[PDB]
Amino acid sequence: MSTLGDLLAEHTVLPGSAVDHLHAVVGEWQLLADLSFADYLMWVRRDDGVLVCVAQCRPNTGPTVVHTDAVGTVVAANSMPLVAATFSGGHSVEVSPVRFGDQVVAVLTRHQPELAARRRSGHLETAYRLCATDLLRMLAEGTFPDASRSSPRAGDGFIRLDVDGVVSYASPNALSAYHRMGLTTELEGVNLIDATRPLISDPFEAHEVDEHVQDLLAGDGKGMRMEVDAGGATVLLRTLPLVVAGRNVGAAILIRDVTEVKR
Amino acid sequence: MSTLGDLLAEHTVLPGSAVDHLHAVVGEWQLLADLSFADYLMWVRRDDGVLVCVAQCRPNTGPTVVHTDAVGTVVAANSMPLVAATFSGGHSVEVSPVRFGDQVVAVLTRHQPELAARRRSGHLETAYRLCATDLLRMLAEGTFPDASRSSPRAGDGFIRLDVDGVVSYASPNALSAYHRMGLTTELEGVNLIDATRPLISDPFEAHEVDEHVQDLLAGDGKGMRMEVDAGGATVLLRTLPLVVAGRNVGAAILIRDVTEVKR
Numbered sequence A, B: 001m002s003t004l005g006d007l008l009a010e011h012t013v014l015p016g017s018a019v020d021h022l023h024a025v026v027g028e029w030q031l032l033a034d035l036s037f038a039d040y041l042m043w044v045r046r047d048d049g050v051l052v053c054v055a056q057c058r059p060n061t062g063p064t065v066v067h068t069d070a071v072g073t074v075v076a077a078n079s080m081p082l083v084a085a086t087f088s089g090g091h092s093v094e095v096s097p098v099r100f101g102d103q104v105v106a107v108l109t110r111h112q113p114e115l116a117a118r119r120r121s122g123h124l125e126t127a128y129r130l131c132a133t134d135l136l137r138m139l140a141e142g143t144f145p146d147a148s149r150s151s152p153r154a155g156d157g158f159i160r161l162d163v164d165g166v167v168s169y170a171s172p173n174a175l176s177a178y179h180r181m182g183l184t185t186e187l188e189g190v191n192l193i194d195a196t197r198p199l200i201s202d203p204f205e206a207h208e209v210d211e212h213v214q215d216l217l218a219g220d221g222k223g224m225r226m227e228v229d230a231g232g233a234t235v236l237l238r239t240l241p242l243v244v245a246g247r248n249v250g251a252a253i254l255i256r257d258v259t260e261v262k263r
């Protein structure tokens, strides 16, 4: 009886809406573990005030520090004072809440390698860690996840857009994919739509992408997954609007060149 | 004009069969870059004896050392003596051939972090690197690839089976997935089918998996991708038979828990 669903039914009295939301978190948090270069555990609090670990993720972009399976672990609340308190007043372990409605419905613990063993902070690792912090804030504010097997992983290609839709960071993989798509220009410092629109092969899709990204940034649209042909290449795109305290602070875009994977 | 296809047509006189095979390599070699914790570049040799880089992959499981896009690079043969020689007589850069028919149709260069900056060799990293060596040998022998967007990545869950179908190594993620599927036992040292069969929910699928793995190990069957329900969980499995000099030396299995990704 080991799934998140079985565990939440056994140990918890969360309503079906919050149960859905936690299922959605676990369905999405590979991206968080990858961008953080960290392990996460998800903890719920029963009636008893007793704590249960109901899910766990490891990063694919670096070593785990949680080699043992933690799921199903049931622990007295005072053996984890902070986690217990995060349910209340709201490894190198950081603790953060997951909100739904306005209740903390779960708490994540983040575990990662001690300082000299970790992914040295080049630009890629900085841009990823900064995005992980943005999503952790959305988790705490109850705005991510909102409401697939094939979507890009962070390592496939990562782009950070600022509020005006200007690329503030593009990973080497993302730049690789845009070159295969026909980009002969830099990506960083350029309006993403202006760089992207001319590359897209079908003129209807070109406009769809343009409108999507405009809506994303405006708060008019949710993130989407899409497959686009450009320049002989086929890329998969996944967009994620980023928000603080009810406002848009740009977007993350994941991209995967699937030209040869497709075929 | 930046795709592998456009590049091979422009610079090469390879027959359509070998052109297919290189497309297949690029469609699959994310798994090699991930298991190697390394970058790869693919090089072809024109008429001129001049060398062209026609594809490039970075690892998702560690930092790249090739930050620049190398695709389309055209270089005199003697500026890369070894690569040139690998076409002939058959970073920390290792060079290996890709055979098709019995010709070397391309050469891979592997580039990776200098020794103190790399993924320290715990068991996971050793098991991955050993499998990468097995596939590089199959590439050199022309037996991999043979002939999807959703299949497991190496980091999702990795299992090495020996010739008798006994698990010689299972990553933490793989063990995690088998626990969600209902495994209350160790995986390492156990016959994989015997551990797996009782967990599978549908009795027809249980038998299919059993037969597949038997065929895989016998050389009676190619690798496959499959989605299975077990114990309330849903996993995606991808099998890869491993072969040296015409014989089976077991198999790699990649597994991804898609219980919450599915939903």
Ligand SMILES: [Br-]
Binding pocket: A028, A030, A031, A152, A153, A154
């Ligand atoms: Br993901």
Ligand SMILES: [Br-]
Binding pocket: A062, A063, A064, B122, B124
């Ligand atoms: Br690890």
Ligand SMILES: [Br-]
Binding pocket: A065, A066, A067, A068
């Ligand atoms: Br542990």
Ligand SMILES: [Br-]
Binding pocket: A067, A068, A069, B175
């Ligand atoms: Br364990």
Ligand SMILES: [Br-]
Binding pocket: A079, A080, A081, A082, A083, A084
């Ligand atoms: Br704590």
Ligand SMILES: [Br-]
Binding pocket: A065, A091, A112, A113, A114, A117
């Ligand atoms: Br450590």
Ligand SMILES: [Br-]
Binding pocket: A126, A127, A130, A160, A168, A169
């Ligand atoms: Br950034």
Ligand SMILES: [Br-]
Binding pocket: A148, A149, A150, A151, B150
């Ligand atoms: Br899918």
Ligand SMILES: [Br-]
Binding pocket: A164, A165, A191, A193, A213, A214, A217
């Ligand atoms: Br825009």
Ligand SMILES: [Br-]
Binding pocket: A124, A155, A156, A157, A171, A172, A173, A174, B058, B064
């Ligand atoms: Br990258």
Ligand SMILES: [Br-]
Binding pocket: A170, A175, A186, A187, A188
């Ligand atoms: Br750029």
Ligand SMILES: [Br-]
Binding pocket: A197, A198, A199
């Ligand atoms: Br345009």
Ligand SMILES: [Br-]
Binding pocket: A194, A197, A198
């Ligand atoms: Br335009």
Ligand SMILES: [Br-]
Binding pocket: A223, A224, A225
């Ligand atoms: Br969508």
Ligand SMILES: [Br-]
Binding pocket: A201, A229, A230, A231, A232, A233
């Ligand atoms: Br196209």
Ligand SMILES: [Br-]
Binding pocket: B028, B030, B031, B152, B153, B154
């Ligand atoms: Br892969």
